[PDB]
Amino acid sequence: QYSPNTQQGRTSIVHLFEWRWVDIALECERYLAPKGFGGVQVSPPNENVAIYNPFRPWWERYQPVSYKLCTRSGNEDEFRNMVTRCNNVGVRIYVDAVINHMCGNAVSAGTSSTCGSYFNPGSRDFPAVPYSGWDFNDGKCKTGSGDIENYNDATQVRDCRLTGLLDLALEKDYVRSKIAEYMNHLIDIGVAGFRLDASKHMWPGDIKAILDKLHNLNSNWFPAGSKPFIYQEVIDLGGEPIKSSDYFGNGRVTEFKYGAKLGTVIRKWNGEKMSYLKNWGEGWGFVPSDRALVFVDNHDNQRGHGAGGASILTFWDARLYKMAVGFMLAHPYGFTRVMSSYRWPRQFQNGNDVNDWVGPPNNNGVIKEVTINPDTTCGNDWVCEHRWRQIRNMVIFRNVVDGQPFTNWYDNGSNQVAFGRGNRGFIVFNNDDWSFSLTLQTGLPAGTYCDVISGDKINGNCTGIKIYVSDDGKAHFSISNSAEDPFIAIHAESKL
Ligand SMILES: *[C@@H]1[C@@H](O)[C@H](CO)[C@@H](O[C@H]2O[C@H](CO)[C@@H](O)[C@H](O)[C@H]2O)[C@H](O)[C@H]1O
Numbered sequence: 406q407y408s409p410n411t412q413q414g415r416t417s418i419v420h421l422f423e424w425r426w427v428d429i430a431l432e433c434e435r436y437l438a439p440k441g442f443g444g445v446q447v448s449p450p451n452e453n454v455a456i457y458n459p460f461r462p463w464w465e466r467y468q469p470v471s472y473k474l475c476t477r478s479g480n481e482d483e484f485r486n487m488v489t490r491c492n493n494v495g496v497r498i499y500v501d502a503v504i505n506h507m508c509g510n511a512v513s514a515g516t517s518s519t520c521g522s523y524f525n526p527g528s529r530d531f532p533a534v535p536y537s538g539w540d541f542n543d544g545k546c547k548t549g550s551g552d553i554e555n556y557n558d559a560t561q562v563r564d565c566r567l568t569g570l571l572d573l574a575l576e577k578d579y580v581r582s583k584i585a586e587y588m589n590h591l592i593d594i595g596v597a598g599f600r601l602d603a604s605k606h607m608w609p610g611d612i613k614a615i616l617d618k619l620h621n622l623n624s625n626w627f628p629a630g631s632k633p634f635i636y637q638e639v640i641d642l643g644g645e646p647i648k649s650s651d652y653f654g655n656g657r658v659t660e661f662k663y664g665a666k667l668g669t670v671i672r673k674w675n676g677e678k679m680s681y682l683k684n685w686g687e688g689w690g691f692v693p694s695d696r697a698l699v700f701v702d703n704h705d706n707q708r709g710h711g712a713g714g715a716s717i718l719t720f721w722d723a724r725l726y727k728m729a730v731g732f733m734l735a736h737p738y739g740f741t742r743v744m745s746s747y748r749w750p751r752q753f754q755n756g757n758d759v760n761d762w763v764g765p766p767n768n769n770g771v772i773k774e775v776t777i778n779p780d781t782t783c784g785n786d787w788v789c790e791h792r793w794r795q796i797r798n799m800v801i802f803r804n805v806v807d808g809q810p811f812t813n814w815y816d817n818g819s820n821q822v823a824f825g826r827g828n829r830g831f832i833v834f835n836n837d838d839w840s841f842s843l844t845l846q847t848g849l850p851a852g853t854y855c856d857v858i859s860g861d862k863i864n865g866n867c868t869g870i871k872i873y874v875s876d877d878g879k880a881h882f883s884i885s886n887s888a889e890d891p892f893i894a895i896h897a898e899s900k901l
């Protein structure tokens with residue numbers, strides 16, 4: 406469950422948040438395959454509540470109605486078409502599995518659902534599964550409200566309703582079997598693994614019992630006996646009884662401390678600075694690297710949801726964001742996920758975004774196509790961070806340097822730092838309020854290298870900065886604090 410099952414030499418996944426299946430299929434073929442992306446995290450592919458007040462929020466997809474593969478992203482045929490086309494070009498699909506809960510207990514009964522299935526939250530009736538009152542934790546939860554009230558009580562966090570979401574009785578073999586039926590449908594279609602949503606709200610042993618029911622990956626594309634990649638969403642920022650290490654026997658875990666601390670460092674909050682990153686990894690209190698799924702931001706915390714955190718860097722902070730993503734993609738810790746977002750009309754009042762609910766770009770609720778502009782950016786209000794040169798080229802950097810050790814660290818005691826990945830790549834950052842001009846040991850063979858942040862290697866030439874490495878491995882770097890991107894990255898495949 407710990408291996409991503411990407412093709413050898415592909416080292417990241419991208420979250421194509423709220424994208425339609427047909428657009429992901431095309432993106433696999435036209436971009437993700439040629440640019441070396443390992444795979445795609447898709448939005449939940451199972452039927453959810455259609456919520457009209459407010460109008461079609463992104464978060465309606467975290468309120469299941471059934472396990473029919475029928476959503477605003479597309480139907481089952483479209484989902485299968487996407488998985489097949491992506492696998493055929495060597496780009497994997499990872500499903501966001503919403504298995505802790507069904508919808509909010511106060512949602513009105515009826516057919517306001519993405520496939521028109523009937524459901525009745527008040528009577529605990531989800532006949533398209535089917536689930537009934539016997540399948541929820543009403544009797545097991547001991548809180549006065551029936552909801553989670555106190556995160557210092559690890560039992561209620563698992564047995565009670567997360568903000569009123571009906572909480573499935575995951576101890577029951579029937580419920581475990583209906584979830585495994587859904588997940589095995591997806592595995593047999595060709596999915597390579599799963600994000601397990603709300604894993605903090607599930608007992609480790611119930612997750613294990615569900616995983617024990619899962620198939621190996623589809624043998625038309627994957628070697629015999631391949632286990633689905635599992636990454637469990639556990640928000641563990643250190644101050645609660647539940648520790649994400651309790652989940653290590655099941656799979657990897659999301660390391661939310663990663664982006665929280667990288668954001669505080671890059672924003673220079675509380676006296677933090679990039680020179681402190683020399684011992685980034687477990688030395689910062691993080692999970693073991695081989696159990697970490699890392700990211701700068703995710704779909705929740707880029708808009709203040711989940712545990713939020715004011716330090717989180719997002720595409721709205723483009724310059725610092727590219728730096729943070731670049732540091733993450735160069736550093737060997739963890740398995741990396743890149744975010745890919747849509748723009749919404751963010752509107753802060755008293756420090757909080759009142760439009761944080763707005764769903765994906767749409768016409769009368771129908772999600773808009775992803776359009777591709779001549780310059781390779783996206784239209785229709787899709788941000789497409791994964792197509793920004795500075796991010797795509799660092800996805801490639803990570804592939805090129807895969808397996809090489811962290812070495813040749815330099816810092817100025819403030820915010821000018823650099824490091825190498827064996828003899829295959831080198832990266833230099835200036836987050837101080839003055840210029841960084843210095844000759845550094847790069848660990849690389851002598852030659853001329855294109856900086857893949859300011860430009861590209863194209864037809865035996867560089868379109869941006871060129872770096873000249875001498876016989877001793879040293880090279881001069883110059884980065885103004887006013888540079889568009891105050892970091893430079895070079896690697897074996899950017900050498901002329
Ligand atoms: C995981 C999922 O467990 C979260 C809870 O459902 C989900 O949260 C979002 O959706 C819920 C339910 O619609 C909203 O109440 C929350 O405000 C919202 O953040 C996470 O997105 C998901 O990652």
Ligand SMILES: [Ca+2]
Binds near residue numbers: 505562565572607
């Ligand atoms: Ca639960």
Ligand SMILES: [Cl-]
Binds near residue numbers: 638659703
């Ligand atoms: Cl996540």
